Design an enzyme around this catalytic site. Structure first.
Site, PDB file in Angstrom:
ATOM      1  N   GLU A  64       0.840  -1.184   0.000  1.00 44.97           N
ATOM      2  CA  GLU A  64       0.000   0.000   0.000  1.00 44.97           C
ATOM      3  C   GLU A  64       0.889   1.254   0.000  1.00 44.97           C
ATOM      4  OE1 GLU A  64      -3.539   0.277  -0.117  1.00 44.97           O
ATOM      5  OE2 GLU A  64      -3.198   2.442  -0.068  1.00 44.97           O
ATOM      6  N   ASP A  92      -2.219  -5.426   0.719  1.00 45.70           N
ATOM      7  CA  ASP A  92      -1.673  -4.270   1.417  1.00 45.70           C
ATOM      8  C   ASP A  92      -0.245  -4.494   1.879  1.00 45.70           C
ATOM      9  OD1 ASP A  92      -3.755  -2.296   1.369  1.00 45.70           O
ATOM     10  OD2 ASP A  92      -4.956  -3.614   2.656  1.00 45.70           O
ATOM     11  N   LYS A 118     -14.790  -8.943   2.259  1.00 49.80           N
ATOM     12  CA  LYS A 118     -13.428  -9.114   1.751  1.00 49.80           C
ATOM     13  C   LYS A 118     -13.173 -10.557   1.341  1.00 49.80           C
ATOM     14  CE  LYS A 118     -11.006  -5.232   2.836  1.00 49.80           C
ATOM     15  NZ  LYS A 118     -10.168  -4.570   1.796  1.00 49.80           N
TER      16      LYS A 118
HETATM   17  O1  LIG Z   1      -5.831  -1.016  -1.901  1.00 49.47           O
HETATM   18  C1  LIG Z   1      -6.936  -0.516  -2.075  1.00 49.47           C
HETATM   19  C2  LIG Z   1      -7.991  -0.636  -1.053  1.00 49.47           C
HETATM   20  C3  LIG Z   1      -7.802  -1.410   0.107  1.00 49.47           C
HETATM   21  O2  LIG Z   1      -6.635  -2.040   0.321  1.00 49.47           O
HETATM   22  C4  LIG Z   1      -8.876  -1.540   1.066  1.00 49.47           C
HETATM   23  O3  LIG Z   1      -8.718  -2.228   2.116  1.00 49.47           O
HETATM   24  C5  LIG Z   1     -10.113  -0.872   0.827  1.00 49.47           C
HETATM   25  C6  LIG Z   1     -10.279  -0.120  -0.335  1.00 49.47           C
HETATM   26  N1  LIG Z   1      -9.238  -0.028  -1.278  1.00 49.47           N
HETATM   27  N2  LIG Z   1      -9.133   0.809  -2.386  1.00 49.47           N
HETATM   28  C7  LIG Z   1      -8.932   2.204  -1.952  1.00 49.47           C
HETATM   29  C8  LIG Z   1      -9.390   2.540  -0.535  1.00 49.47           C
HETATM   30  C9  LIG Z   1      -8.491   2.358   0.512  1.00 49.47           C
HETATM   31  C10 LIG Z   1      -8.852   2.637   1.815  1.00 49.47           C
HETATM   32  C11 LIG Z   1     -10.116   3.094   2.100  1.00 49.47           C
HETATM   33  C12 LIG Z   1     -11.031   3.270   1.083  1.00 49.47           C
HETATM   34  C13 LIG Z   1     -10.685   3.000  -0.242  1.00 49.47           C
HETATM   35  S1  LIG Z   1     -12.009   3.296  -1.384  1.00 49.47           S
HETATM   36  C14 LIG Z   1     -11.560   2.803  -3.064  1.00 49.47           C
HETATM   37  C15 LIG Z   1     -10.384   3.654  -3.455  1.00 49.47           C
HETATM   38  C16 LIG Z   1      -9.117   3.346  -2.941  1.00 49.47           C
HETATM   39  C17 LIG Z   1      -8.035   4.153  -3.276  1.00 49.47           C
HETATM   40  C18 LIG Z   1      -8.186   5.232  -4.135  1.00 49.47           C
HETATM   41  C19 LIG Z   1      -9.429   5.515  -4.638  1.00 49.47           C
HETATM   42  F1  LIG Z   1      -9.604   6.561  -5.479  1.00 49.47           F
HETATM   43  C20 LIG Z   1     -10.518   4.739  -4.300  1.00 49.47           C
HETATM   44  F2  LIG Z   1     -11.722   5.038  -4.807  1.00 49.47           F
HETATM   45  C21 LIG Z   1      -8.644   0.422  -3.692  1.00 49.47           C
HETATM   46  C22 LIG Z   1      -9.342  -0.755  -4.324  1.00 49.47           C
HETATM   47  O4  LIG Z   1      -8.635  -1.131  -5.508  1.00 49.47           O
HETATM   48  C23 LIG Z   1      -7.303  -1.544  -5.192  1.00 49.47           C
HETATM   49  C24 LIG Z   1      -6.541  -0.439  -4.502  1.00 49.47           C
HETATM   50  N3  LIG Z   1      -7.284   0.008  -3.318  1.00 49.47           N
HETATM   51 MN   LIG Z   2      -6.811  -2.735   2.557  1.00 44.29          MN
HETATM   52 MN   LIG Z   3      -4.747  -1.655  -0.464  1.00 38.71          MN
END
Ligand SMILES: O=C1c2c(O)c(=O)ccn2N([C@@H]2c3ccccc3SCc3c2ccc(F)c3F)[C@@H]2COCCN12
Ligand SMILES: [Mn+2]
Ligand SMILES: [Mn+2]
Length: 179
Positions: A64, A92, A118
């Protein structure tokens, strides 16, 4: 400009805010409009960094906080050198000691239901899952919590402090009711 955008900037350290912005722009979202998402991405980053700080030195590869392309690059080097199967979705962390990816989740809801979502989602039984909630609960795959408990307790305390900070500013209700 939101109350929330200003709170995020005074609540989180500048490195984390900066990385969250990088992440949102990698997916074309705007921190100035999607402001609850901004707070959550910041929170998740801090938890992830606090988590990797809990091991022995060299225990964790942090995936991450990288841009999409470099994150997958590091996953590839991990897979092509440990022989672990390449996940379909970005994790992550990677635990060099237990030899598994970790997906860390932070939830406003009850840990049980986010964990299910998840586990459903990843469809890869090899990626270890560890959920934290803003109420001090946690849930990990196979009841295996990876870190010893002082390191998990710090995360839970920090999560609850963010919750109070949000609440003292009447941001908390809108934050919960956006999952
Ligand atoms: O790595 C993550 C990710 C997680 O690891 C997670 O636990 C939850 C959610 N994720 N995502 C995050 C993220 C991370 C933490 C809290 C909310 C969000 S909401 C979606 C979003 C993320 C990042 C940028 C963005 F513009 C988004 F809309 C995206 C999912 O696609 C893989 C990468 N990522
Ligand atoms: Mn995560
Ligand atoms: Mn992530």
């Amino acid at each position: 400009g939101s109350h929330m955008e200003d709170f995020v900037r005074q609540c989180f350290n500048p490195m984390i805010v900066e990385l969250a912005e990088k992440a949102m722009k990698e997916y074309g979202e705007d921190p100035k409009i999607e402001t609850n998402k901004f707070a959550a991405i910041c929170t998740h980053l801090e938890v992830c960094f606090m988590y990797s700080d809990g091991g022995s030195k060299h225990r964790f590869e942090i995936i991450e906080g990288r841009d999409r392309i470099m994150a997958w690059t590091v996953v590839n080097s991990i897979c092509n050198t440990t022989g672990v199967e390449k996940p379909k979705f970005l994790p992550d962390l990677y635990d060099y000691k237990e030899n598994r990816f970790i997906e860390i989740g932070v939830t406003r809801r009850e840990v049980h239901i986010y964990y299910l979502e998840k586990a459903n989602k990843i469809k890869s039984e090899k990626t270890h899952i560890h959920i934290f909630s803003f109420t001090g609960e946690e849930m990990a795959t196979k009841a295996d919590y990876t870190l010893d408990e002082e390191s998990r307790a710090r995360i839970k305390t920090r999560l609850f402090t963010i919750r109070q900070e949000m609440a003292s500013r009447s941001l908390w209700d809108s934050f919960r009711q956006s999952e």
